[PDB]
Amino acid sequence: STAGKVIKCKAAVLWEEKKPFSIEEVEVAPPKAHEVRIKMVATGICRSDDHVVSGTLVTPLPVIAGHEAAGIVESIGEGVTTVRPGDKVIPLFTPQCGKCRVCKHPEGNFCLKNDLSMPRGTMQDGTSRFTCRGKPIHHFLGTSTFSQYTVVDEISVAKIDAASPLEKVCLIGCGFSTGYGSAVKVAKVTQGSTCAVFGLGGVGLSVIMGCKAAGAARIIGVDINKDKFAKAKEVGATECVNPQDYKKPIQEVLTEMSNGGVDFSFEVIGRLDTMVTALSCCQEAYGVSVIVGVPPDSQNLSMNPMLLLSGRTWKGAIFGGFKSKDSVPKLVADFMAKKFALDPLITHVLPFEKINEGFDLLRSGESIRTILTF
């Protein structure tokens, strides 16, 4: 039995940037008040986890990364009311405290308790529940899912359907929800519209799914890797373009293709240049462009504000605009009710011990989502 006790378990520790993960034994403290200890069942490899490795996304090291996951509650701390031992859960990398001005706002979801703006790499109380070789190890986004067990604050966990297939619904913890919500909630794609999606990875494919669900007439996928095009068409892209195939800048190409600019564009890569291209290719008077890709640390883009003065709208969002704790259980229920598909995103399923191989598949261009199973 493990409740109230330190657990020794396997985790993937990142000791420094640009190194493989180290799979080794960690100690996981029991949960304090308003904390939840979770036995991991499956976790996805999101490009944002690779950003921690590459130093694109700065967070304190050493760290247990991983934020797209699902598992089963092993134990609860004093005062927890929202989950119980044995419940299936999804950790929430964007918390929902329910008390801050953002949580109380009808359209806000970036709760002020997040650890993304100004990452500390701790629990809410400023301390870590992880040690490895006698050293404290940082948390990541209040989740840290590259471990057989994690501890999360109550505001960073949602209870989901007991009959949930966790090897699929772990994608509702980041990539599916982000892309789908970016289309249906943040952009509010309209029926009959023309959309352009920059980046056809797991998140970009989820954007396509949402644009098709919203009734877009045309969905143009844009990627420099033409191997991504077949799956993009399977999930709703009406045509795909590779910028490398053209002499002109792709914003000019997309403007021409859409007879004067697209209704909605999405940046789902994480490059400054594609953020500006995606804004430019939306119609100058009424177009909307949404930034989804995480930009490189501390780098500014350059743009001409006449792109906005003519009437464009530019916005971004975390986690598809979804209020996390309210939304994740409903998304799982909707998945169970066959409202959307997750299998198109899953290209590889590996044991957790093969995490590095899973990252190598992402980096080589050869996977969409690898799901790691504990």
Ligand X SMILES: NC(=O)c1ccc[n+]([C@@H]2O[C@H](COP(=O)([O-])OP(=O)([O-])OC[C@H]3O[C@@H](n4cnc5c(N)[nH+]cnc54)[C@H](O)[C@@H]3O)[C@@H](O)[C@H]2O)c1
Bind-site residues for NAD(+)? 48, 199-204, 223, 228, 292-294, 319, 369
Contact call for residue 123 and Zn ion (CB under 5 A): no
First-to-last C-alpha distance (Å) of the chain: 19
Distances (CA, A) of 151 to 35, 52, 53, 114, 154: 7, 20, 22, 16, 9
Active site residue 139: no
Both structure tokens of 111: 């709760």
Stretch that binds ligand X, among 11-19, 133-141, 174-182, 210-218 (CB under 6 A): 174-182
Contact call for residue 46 and Zn ion (CB under 5 A): yes
Catalytic residue, candidates 147, 170, 174, 282: 174
Catalytic residue, candidates 48, 258, 280, 327: 48
Q: Is 111 exposed, middle or buried (0-12, 13-18, 19+ CB in 10 A)?
A: buried
- Annotated binding site: which residue ranges? 46, 48, 67, 97, 100, 103, 111, 174, 199-204, 223, 228, 292-294, 319, 369
Stretch that binds Zn ion, among 92-100, 204-212, 320-328, 350-358 (CB under 5 A): 92-100
Distance CA(296)–CA(129), nearest Å, equals 29
Cβ closer to its own copies: 301 or 341? 301
CA–centroid distance for 51 within its chain: 12
Contact call for residue 324 and ligand X (CB under 6 A): no
Pairing between β-strand 264-267 and β-strand 194-198 as defined by DSSP bridges? parallel
Distance CA(290)–CA(294), nearest Å, equals 12
Half-sphere exposure of 157 (CA within 13 A, CB side): 32
| Min separation Cβ 184 and its own copies, Å | 16
Task: Please give the residue ranges that form the binding site for its own copies (CB under 8 A).
Answer: 101-102, 105, 107-110, 112, 117, 259-260, 272, 275, 283-286, 291-292, 294-295, 298-306, 308-318, 321
Cβ closer to Zn ion: 216 or 323? 323
Confirm if 179 and 267 have CB atoms less than 8 A apart.
no
Residues binding ligand X (CB under 6 A): 46-48, 51, 174-175, 178, 198-204, 222-225, 228, 243, 268-271, 274, 292-294, 309, 318-319, 365
Residues binding Zn ion (CB under 5 A): 46, 48, 97, 100, 103, 111, 174
